[PDB]
């Protein structure tokens, strides 16, 4: 959208999507950014045990119908000073994702359903605390799971 890149300043409690949407007026990318700003788990006891649940937009996979609407908005988007080969490459790389609408709506239906059926067999609390060591995720594995 022609905007200057942000300097983050770590000390704020505001994530880059959370500053970005207050700086971006689209009604299509802003829907997606405001989803991701406040998707978090919802703490409720079910039969005694506390559980960390998704909202129902992730749960039935309907939220991907907005991410792909926000992605093919970034595909009809001319960039003001990017070189054209890297721009055409990044627009077609977005179109690699935005043409798998149903294939990823159904994938985040399946992922959430497996999380559902295995969350029922939890018997201790599902406490969310930031652990010390982290399980490293490769985004290459996410691109593999997508495509």
């Amino acid at each position: 959208f022609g905007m200057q890149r942000m300097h983050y300043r770590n000390g704020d409690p505001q994530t880059p999507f959370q500053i970005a949407e207050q700086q971006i007026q689209n009604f299509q990318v802003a829907n997606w950014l405001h989803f991701v700003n406040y998707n978090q788990f919802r703490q409720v006891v079910i039969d005694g045990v506390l559980n960390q649940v998704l909202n129902d937009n992730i749960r039935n996979g309907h939220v991907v119908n907005q991410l792909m609407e926000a992605l093919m908005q970034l595909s009809r988007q001319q960039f003001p000073t990017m070189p054209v080969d890297y721009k055409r490459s990044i627009q077609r790389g977005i179109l690699l994702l935005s043409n798998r609408l149903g294939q990823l709506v159904d994938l985040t239906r399946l992922l959430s359903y497996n999380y559902e059926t295995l969350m029922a067999c939890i018997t201790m609390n599902m406490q969310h605390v930031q652990t010390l060591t982290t399980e490293k995720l490769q985004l290459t594995s996410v691109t593999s799971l997508c495509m």
Binding site: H34, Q40, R42, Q43, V44, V45, I46, N51, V53, D56
Partner: protein, 397 residues
């Protein structure tokens, strides 16, 4: 305004639908809207009140989302929902009392309080929900300039005007002629009287006429038209026009001969009714013209012939009346009636907090002085404050 109705509609539904033991599929589409509301309202601060004795309250929203993982809603979920709902209900109560209390001569249809000017942004536009009540439907239709209609049961379209008119008079006040009327609420009671009982009128017939102009154009009105106006049918003493002396009125009642009730819109006769009583209909009108006449009875028994001599002393005065009561009507502008309590809520908020008289509304919210001079700026202010009163009447009982 749309987001304020949306906040109140979700809080009403979440007091109604989110109960103990109910199935989750009954509330699965409401919890998502309530979570969207929490996500939108977090991080924002508001300030309500500051006029009259309405206290300044600061509002800060820091709430967690509600759980989406139950099958039947247990009492934990109901109690945390009741906490969040009670805080938001107190917030929207104070926003509505901050908005009904303010007014502007310049553009009254715009929000005047700081909280509702802050809620009128597109950041808060994702709060928005269905707009199903009549006042928010007519708000959204008049925000796009389409035709609206408010359905009123006995609308207060007439200002209080109890007066008379002497077509024939003298300082003796023993041979008078003219009309008397009571315009009150939705009811016109008119009575033309002659003391001579048309003993010297041509063809023993005296023509009366009473023209009531309205302030707003009523549409599809059911009207009970009865003869024999009951209030102007007993003896009374009445002050004169200048208030100097008083004159006596001892009526005997003839029936109204040749009743013609016409419903005028821009001077054109829309509906007319000739000697038909009971329930009548008037489809489109802003002026009501009652044309009744007093005819001297040509055959009289000896009990009647002693009442009306040919000479001067008339101890019994001929009087002919009509009664016209608008039972229900559809009006494009806002009014008050016997069904809603919105004007009562507006006056209760303006009188409870000792509010100074502003530039638009009459002192003390006098509805007679408000419908006597019903300007379009006052119309816009009245519609805005009635819409906010309807919103608060949804939340606060």
């Amino acid at each position: 305004m749309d987001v304020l109705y949306s906040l109140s509609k979700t809080l009403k539904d979440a007091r109604d639908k989110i109960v103990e033991g109910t199935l989750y599929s009954n509330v699965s589409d409401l919890i998502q809207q309530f979570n969207q509301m929490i996500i939108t309202m977090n991080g924002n601060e508001f300030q309500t009140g500051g006029i009259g004795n309405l206290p300044i309250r600061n509002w800060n929203f820091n709430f967690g989302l509600l759980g989406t993982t139950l099958l039947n809603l247990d009492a934990n979920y109901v109690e945390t929902a009741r906490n969040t709902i009670d805080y938001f209900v107190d917030f929207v109560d104070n926003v509505c009392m901050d908005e009904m209390v303010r007014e502007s001569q310049r553009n009254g249809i715009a929000p005047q309080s700081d909280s509702l000017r802050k809620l009128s942004a597109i950041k808060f536009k994702r709060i928005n929900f269905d707009n199903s009540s009549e006042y928010i439907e007519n708000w959204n239709l008049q925000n796009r300039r389409q035709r609206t209609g408010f359905t009123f049961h006995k609308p207060n379209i007439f200002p209080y005007s109890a007066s008379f008119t002497l077509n024939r008079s003298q300082p003796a006040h023993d041979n008078l002629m003219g009309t008397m009327w009571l315009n009150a609420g939705s009811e016109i009671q008119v009575a033309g009287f002659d003391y001579s009982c048309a003993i010297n009128a041509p063809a023993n017939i005296q023509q009366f006429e009473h023209i009531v102009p309205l302030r707003r154009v009523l549409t599809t009105a059911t009207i009970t038209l009865l003869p024999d106006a009951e209030r102007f049918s007993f003896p009374r003493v009445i002050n004169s026009a200048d208030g100097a002396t008083t004159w006596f009125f001892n009526p005997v009642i003839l029936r109204p001969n040749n009743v013609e009730v016409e419903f005028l819109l821009n001077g054109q006769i829309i509906n007319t009714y000739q000697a038909r009583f009971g329930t009548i209909v008037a489809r489109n009108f802003d002026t009501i013209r009652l044309s009744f006449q007093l005819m001297r009875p040509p055959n009289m028994t000896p009990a009647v012939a002693v009442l009306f001599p040919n000479a001067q002393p008339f101890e019994h005065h001929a009087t002919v009346g009509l009664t016209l009561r608008i039972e229900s009507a559809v009006c494009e502008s806002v009014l008050a009636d016997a069904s809603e309590t919105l004007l009562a809520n507006v006056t209760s908020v303006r009188q409870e907090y000792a509010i100074p008289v502003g530039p638009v509304f009459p002192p003390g919210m006098n509805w007679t002085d408000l419908i006597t001079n019903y300007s379009p700026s006052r119309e816009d202010n009245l519609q805005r404050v009635f819409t906010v009163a309807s919103i608060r009447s949804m939340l606060i009982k």
